[PDB]
Design a protein around this ligand. Structure first.
Ligand SMILES: CCCCC[C@H](O)/C=C/[C@@H]1[C@@H](C/C=C\CCCC(=O)O)[C@H]2CO[C@@H]1C2
Length: 167
């Protein structure tokens, strides 16, 4: 048994976090998004400084089940472990918080969206800057998931891109 609503650890450092990253772990607290989460395998993800003085995470996946190519702009909001990025939904509204993240080790972020519609969807992204399995990151994210009420069908850990003939 376990419990927990959510929590963010202040003192975030984009200096040793911003940049290119490798897919390792992901999650989602949505019911409609999960139906699509099962079709998003490994790929490339890089976050660079936005032209508007912020952050821009560009995603890209070629071949293998599905080919993706998008980019979001994250802008800090008050606390260090709190930002927002115009996502898909007409008015593009999103919010993200750093539940932990370590220096030169790994980066973890939780993206939740709260809009009038009442979506109240959440997400957990794990970025590996080494391409290795971290016990702390694995345990911190996996466990933190319980507090975030993750979804077994929403979790995505560096899926195998053995999708052939999907050019
Ligand atoms: C609404 C916000 C969406 C943010 C998406 C995010 O910036 C992308 C993350 C990359 C994912 C693959 C990319 C796209 C999957 C799209 C699935 C879909 O068609 O809806 C996973 C592999 O590396 C990471 C985790």
């Amino acid at each position: 048994g376990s419990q927990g609503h959510d929590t963010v650890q202040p003192n975030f450092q984009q200096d040793k976090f911003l940049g290119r990253w490798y897919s390792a772990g992901l999650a989602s607290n949505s019911s409609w998004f999960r139906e699509k989460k099962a079709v998003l395998y490994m790929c490339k993800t890089v976050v660079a400084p936005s032209t508007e003085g912020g952050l821009n995470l560009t995603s890209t996946f070629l071949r293998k089940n599905q080919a993706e190519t998008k980019i979001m702009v994250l802008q800090p909001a008050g606390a260090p472990g709190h930002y927002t990025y115009s996502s898909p939904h007409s008015g593009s509204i999103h919010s993200v918080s750093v539940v932990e993240a370590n220096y030169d080790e790994y980066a973890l972020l939780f993206s939740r969206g709260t809009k009038g519609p009442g979506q109240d969807f959440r997400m957990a992204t794990l970025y590996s800057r080494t391409q290795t399995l971290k016990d702390e990151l694995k345990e911190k994210f996996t466990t933190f998931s319980k507090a975030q009420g993750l979804t077994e069908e929403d979790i995505v850990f560096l899926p195998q891109p053995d999708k052939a003939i999907q050019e």
